Design a protein around this ligand. Structure first.
Ligand SMILES: O=c1ccn([C@@H]2O[C@H](COP(=O)(O)OP(=O)(O)O)[C@@H](O)[C@H]2O)c(=O)[nH]1
Ligand SMILES: COC(=O)CCCCCCCCO[C@@H]1O[C@H](CO)[C@H](O)[C@H](O)[C@H]1O
Ligand SMILES: [Cl-]
Ligand SMILES: [Hg+2]
Ligand SMILES: [Hg+2]
Ligand SMILES: [Hg+2]
Ligand SMILES: [Hg+2]
Ligand SMILES: [Hg+2]
Ligand SMILES: [Hg+2]
Ligand SMILES: [Mn+2]
Length: 261
């Protein structure tokens, strides 16, 4: 469907978006930083498609305590204006807090899937011991995306904590690797996310049988997958930070999703 008339600042071809950071990967995938996108145009594009975003989180044992802040802040900053379906996987259904949600947003509690394919267009998978502090919207939606780990975004590949043992399916040699993605925030279309989760599950089963466990578990496999299946968008550390441990550097114009102290 055609976009309606819109009035906004004209993009300037001879004026770089950001001159301090890389905003596009070598395989032409945008790296999402504040200043690279006009959210009004993007909101229009995704709303015209009546986009539904599923947000999945696991809250087991004492982690159910993080749900209230997580959901409350998600209501203020996550995909506001769009259809959102929260999926909370927990071992304590009765412990899930009663959070008030805006219109067009719902929450499903699953006690511990084709359902995802028929319910949402995109799946966003994150850790629950976090809080949203600023805008996290449709600028992240794409077939497959990963997020730059805050501890290695400025490091050389040799420093990346990839699994280095050739006996592991998550193995990545010192001369390979684009970025080190953190397992705490990834997503994409339901189809691509299920392909990724299926691939990692099978790879971890193989390691299990071979008597080996990847150095950083699921994250090690996530990195191996994204190395071989390039993400169509990469999120900057604005999307995964810890102000207490890492402060607020100039390169980050916004701190959007952070660890809870
Ligand atoms: O006993 C646990 C351990 C982990 N988690 C989930 O797994 C995520 C990632 O593990 P964790 O946050 O403990 O380590 P980090 O990922 O912070 O290194 C947690 O945020 C929770 O979402 C959980 O629900 N119960
Ligand atoms: C849960 O809170 C967050 O995700 C915010 C960012 C935390 C940044 C932590 C930086 C220090 C290292 O963290 C560890 O890094 C290894 C890989 O080297 C793994 O990713 C661990 O899960 C992570 O805790
Ligand atoms: Cl998840
Ligand atoms: Hg720009
Ligand atoms: Hg997920
Ligand atoms: Hg997750
Ligand atoms: Hg994998
Ligand atoms: Hg897995
Ligand atoms: Hg994975
Ligand atoms: Mn965490």
């Amino acid at each position: 469907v055609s976009l309606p008339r819109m009035v906004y600042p004209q993009p300037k071809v001879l004026t770089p978006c950001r001159k301090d950071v890389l905003v596009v990967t070598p395989w032409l995938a945008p790296i999402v930083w504040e200043g690279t996108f006009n959210i009004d145009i993007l909101n229009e594009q995704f709303r015209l498609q009546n986009t539904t975003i599923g947000l999945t989180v696991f809250a087991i044992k004492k982690y159910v305590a993080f749900l209230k802040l997580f959901l409350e802040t998600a209501e203020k900053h996550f995909m506001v204006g769009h259809r959102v379906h929260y999926y909370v996987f927990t071992d304590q259904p009765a412990a899930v807090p009663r959070v008030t949600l805006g219109t067009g947003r719902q929450l499903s509690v699953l006690e511990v899937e084709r359902r995802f394919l028929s319910e949402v267009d995109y799946l966003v998978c994150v850790d629950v011991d976090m809080e949203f502090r600023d805008h996290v919207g449709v600028e992240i939606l794409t077939p497959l995306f990963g997020t730059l780990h805050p501890s290695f975004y400025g490091s050389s590949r040799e420093a990346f904590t990839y699994e280095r043992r050739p006996q592991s399916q998550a193995y990545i040699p010192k001369d390979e690797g684009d970025f080190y993605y953190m397992g705490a925030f990834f997503g994409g279309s339901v189809q691509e996310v299920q392909r990724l989760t299926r691939a990692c599950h099978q790879a971890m089963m193989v390691d299990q049988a071979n008597g080996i466990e990847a150095v950083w578990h699921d994250e090690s496999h996530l990195n191996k997958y994204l190395l071989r299946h390039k993400p169509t968008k990469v999120l900057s550390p604005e999307y995964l930070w810890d102000q207490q441990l890492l402060g607020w550097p100039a390169v980050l114009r916004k701190l959007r999703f952070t660890a809870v102290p």
